Amino acid sequence: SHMKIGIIFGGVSEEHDISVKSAREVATHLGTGVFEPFYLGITKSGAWQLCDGPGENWEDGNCRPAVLSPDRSVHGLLVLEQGKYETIRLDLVLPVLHGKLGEDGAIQGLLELSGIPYVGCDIQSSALCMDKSLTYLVARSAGIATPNFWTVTADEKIPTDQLTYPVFVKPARSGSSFGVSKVAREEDLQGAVEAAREYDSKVLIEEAVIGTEIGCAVMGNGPELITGEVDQITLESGSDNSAVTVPADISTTSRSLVQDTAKAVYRALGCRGLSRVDLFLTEDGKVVLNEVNTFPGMTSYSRYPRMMTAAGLSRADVIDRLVSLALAG
Amino acid sequence: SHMKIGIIFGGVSEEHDISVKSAREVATHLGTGVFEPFYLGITKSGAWQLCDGPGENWEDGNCRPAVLSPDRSVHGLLVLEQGKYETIRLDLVLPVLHGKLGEDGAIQGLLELSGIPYVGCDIQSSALCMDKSLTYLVARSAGIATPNFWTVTADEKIPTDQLTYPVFVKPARSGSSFGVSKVAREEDLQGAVEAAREYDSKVLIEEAVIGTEIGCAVMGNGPELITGEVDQITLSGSDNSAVTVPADISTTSRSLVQDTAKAVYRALGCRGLSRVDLFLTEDGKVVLNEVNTFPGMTSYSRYPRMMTAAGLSRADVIDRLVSLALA
Ligand SMILES: Nc1ncnc2c1ncn2[C@@H]1O[C@H](COP(=O)(O)OP(=O)(O)OP(=O)(O)O)[C@@H](O)[C@H]1O
Ligand SMILES: Nc1ncnc2c1ncn2[C@@H]1O[C@H](COP(=O)(O)OP(=O)(O)OP(=O)(O)O)[C@@H](O)[C@H]1O
Ligand SMILES: [Mg+2]
Numbered sequence A: 001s002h003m004k005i006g007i008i009f010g011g012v013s014e015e016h017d018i019s020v021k022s023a024r025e026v027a028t029h030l031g032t033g034v035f036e037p038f039y040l041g042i043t044k045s046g047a048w049q050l051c052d053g054p055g056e057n058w059e060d061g062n063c064r065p066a067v068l069s070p071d072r073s074v075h076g077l078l079v080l081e082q083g084k085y086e087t088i089r090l091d092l093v094l095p096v097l098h099g100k101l102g103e104d105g106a107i108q109g110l111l112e113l114s115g116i117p118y119v120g121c122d123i124q125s126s127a128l129c130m131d132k133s134l135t136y137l138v139a140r141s142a143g144i145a146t147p148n149f150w151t152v153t154a155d156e157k158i159p160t161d162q163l164t165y166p167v168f169v170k171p172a173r174s175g176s177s178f179g180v181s182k183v184a185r186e187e188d189l190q191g192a193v194e195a196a197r198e199y200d201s202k203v204l205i206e207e208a209v210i211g212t213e214i215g216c217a218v219m220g221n222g223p224e225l226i227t228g229e230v231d232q233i234t235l236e237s238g239s240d241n242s243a244v245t246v247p248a249d250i251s252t253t254s255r256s257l258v259q260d261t262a263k264a265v266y267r268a269l270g271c272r273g274l275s276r277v278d279l280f281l282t283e284d285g286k287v288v289l290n291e292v293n294t295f296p297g298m299t300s301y302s303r304y305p306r307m308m309t310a311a312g313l314s315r316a317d318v319i320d321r322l323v324s325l326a327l328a329g
Numbered sequence B: 001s002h003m004k005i006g007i008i009f010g011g012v013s014e015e016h017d018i019s020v021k022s023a024r025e026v027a028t029h030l031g032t033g034v035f036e037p038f039y040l041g042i043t044k045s046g047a048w049q050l051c052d053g054p055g056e057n058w059e060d061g062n063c064r065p066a067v068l069s070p071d072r073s074v075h076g077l078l079v080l081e082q083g084k085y086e087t088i089r090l091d092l093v094l095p096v097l098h099g100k101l102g103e104d105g106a107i108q109g110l111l112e113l114s115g116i117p118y119v120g121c122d123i124q125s126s127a128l129c130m131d132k133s134l135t136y137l138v139a140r141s142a143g144i145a146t147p148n149f150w151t152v153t154a155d156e157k158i159p160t161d162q163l164t165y166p167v168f169v170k171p172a173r174s175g176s177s178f179g180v181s182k183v184a185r186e187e188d189l190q191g192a193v194e195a196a197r198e199y200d201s202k203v204l205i206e207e208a209v210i211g212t213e214i215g216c217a218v219m220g221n222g223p224e225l226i227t228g229e230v231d232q233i234t235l236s237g238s239d240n241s242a243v244t245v246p247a248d249i250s251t252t253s254r255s256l257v258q259d260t261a262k263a264v265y266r267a268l269g270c271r272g273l274s275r276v277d278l279f280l281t282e283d284g285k286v287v288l289n290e291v292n293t294f295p296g297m298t299s300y301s302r303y304p305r306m307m308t309a310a311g312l313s314r315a316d317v318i319d320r321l322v323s324l325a326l327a
C-alpha cells in the first residue's frame, strides 16, 4: 500500500502565493514507494479543487471540484463532478497553508471534525500563535521575555500619550510582514494603524527590540523535541524571504539558550509537529520572543528548511518525520 | 422569502444529548414567518445528516446525508443521495453544539472556511474559553481574579508538594461537569486525575474557591453588550442545578457581577453570546469560574432562565443572535 496523503494548499489568505510555493517544494520531496498524494488547492476565491499538482497556474490545469468532508464515516474527500460524487478515503492530511484560515485554526477545525490525522499544530496552538498578543500572553506565563506591547481594536483609541519611539505597528494576526510598519514619530502613527487594519481589525503596537534577529526551527510532539541550526537575519517581503546566515554567528551558549528558549515556548504554547520560533537576541545576551510560526514557509528559499537541512535533516527526512508524528497516536 | 438558517446539532461530544435538547428548544421558538430551517444533526459517531428536526432519536427518522461545505462558492450545504448531490445555499448557521468539537473552535473552523455568517464565538475565543487554563491566563491580564490552578499533561507528574486542600480536579477542556472531582486527600488524587483523563489529556487542578456560585448571561458583539438577570446556584452539572433568579445579592454586588462578566467577554473576544460562571466570596469580591461560549439552551437551562427574567423571550433571544450574526 502507499499512504494516501491529502496535500492542501493555496487558500483565501494574503499568503496564498507563498503557500503554492511551499506545496510545490513538498511535492518534489515525497519519494516513490511511500505516498499517493492528492493535491487539494483552495483558490483565492475560496473554491476547492483537486488538481494535478501545485504550481502556477494550476487553476488553469486539470481540476476537479472537491472538498475535505467533516463526516467521519468518509474519513477523506468528496469529489464533485457534475451532480455525481465519489469518496476518496485519506490516511493523513498535510495542510501546507500559510496565514489566515490556515494557521488560524480554521482548517484544523475541519480536520478535527474529520477525525483524519494531520500535520502541525492544533486548533489551540494555532490560535495562540496567530494572535501574537496571545503568544506573548502565554510566553510571559512560562517566564519568557517579550516585547512591550499595546493592543488596539476598532473600538479603542491609540494610547499615544504613552509611547516611546521607535515603535512597530502590526496586525495582531498576520504574517510575512503584511501590515507591519516601523514608526519613529507620533505623526506617522495613524497611517500605520490604518495600513495594519487592512489586515486585522485588532492592531498590535510594539516597543522596538534592539538586537539580532534569530530564528529556530522546532520539530516534535509534546516534550520530545529537536531543533535545527539557529539562523540569523543578515544585512516588502517578510522575514522568510530575507538574507540569512546559517548557522548564526553567536556564542555556543547563545545558541543553546536560543534553542532551549524556542523549545520552552513551543512547549508552553502546546505546539505540535513543527513551528518556527522567531527571536531577538540583545547585546546583553538575553533572549526575547518575536513570533511562533506554526506552519512556516517551506519554499526553496524558506528559512525553516534551510535550518533543518544544515542540521542534517533532508527535506524528505523532515516530511517523513512530520508524517509519522501526525500518526503518532 | 424565508431565511435559510442551518441549525447544526448533536456532535461527537460528551454533551451530545444536551445539544439535542438545546436544538429542540430553539426549534420551537423560530416562528412561522421568518425562518426556513435546516436541521443538520451530527451523529454520536460523527456522521452528518439532514433530518426532520432535533430530538429523541432523530437519527431514526428521515435523515438524508449531507455536509456543510467549506467551499465558498457553495455558501451552504451539499446533499448526498445515491451518488447524486444537490446544493442548498444558507444565509446563516446556528451551531447548537456543546463541548468538544462544538465550543472548542472546530465547527467555527469549518464555518470560517465556508464564508457563511454564524451565531456565536469565533475560533479564537472558543478555544480560549474551552481550555479553562487559557481563560484564566487571559482574565488575569484583564485584572480579573481566578482560582489558584496547576496543570498536568500525561507526561508531567502532578505537583503534590504545591497543592492545598480542598482542591478540584477537572478536564482542562470539557463541560457539564464531566470528569470534575472534589479531592479531599492526597490519596484520592491520582484517581480523580485518571477520572478526568477519560476526557482530556491535559488536566487542570484548582484550589477550592469559597463563595456563592453566581451566573451571568451576556449578549452582544464588541463592546456594546447586554446582560440577563444574575443567577445563583441555590446551595448533572451546573446547568441542571437548582438555581434562583435573580440572585439574592446586593445591588452593588450585582452591578459588579455584570461589569465583571462583560469585561471578561471583552477580554476574551467573545461574540454573539456566552454564559459566565463566577464566584462571589464573602468579602464581596469576584473570582472567575468558566466562560460558557454556547451554553445550554434547554428548557431547564440557566442562560434562558436568566434572559427571560430580564424580559427577553426565548424567541427574542434567537432573533437577536441572528441579527447579531449578520451585523
Ligand atoms: N517589536 C519589534 N522590535 C523590533 N523589530 C520588530 C518588532 N516587531 C516587528 N519587528 C520587525 O519587523 C518584522 C515584523 O514581522 P513579525 O515577525 O513581527 O510579523 P510577521 O507578519 O509574522 O512577519 P514574519 O512572518 O515575516 O516574521 C520583524 O521581522 C522585525 O524585523
Ligand atoms: N476551584 C473551585 N472551587 C470551588 N468549586 C469549584 C471549583 N472548580 C469547580 N468547582 C465546582 O464544581 C463544578 C465544576 O464545574 P466547572 O465549571 O469547573 O466545569 P464544567 O464541567 O464546565 O461544569 P459546568 O459547565 O456545568 O459549569 C462547578 O459546579 C463548581 O461548583
Ligand atoms: Mg509569521
Ligand SMILES: [Mg+2]
Pocket (backbone or CB within 6 Å): A239, A278, A290, A291
Ligand atoms: Mg518574524
Ligand SMILES: [Mg+2]
Pocket (backbone or CB within 6 Å): B174, B175, B176, B290, B291, B292
Ligand atoms: Mg462548561
Ligand SMILES: [Mg+2]
Pocket (backbone or CB within 6 Å): B238, B277, B289, B290
Ligand atoms: Mg461552571
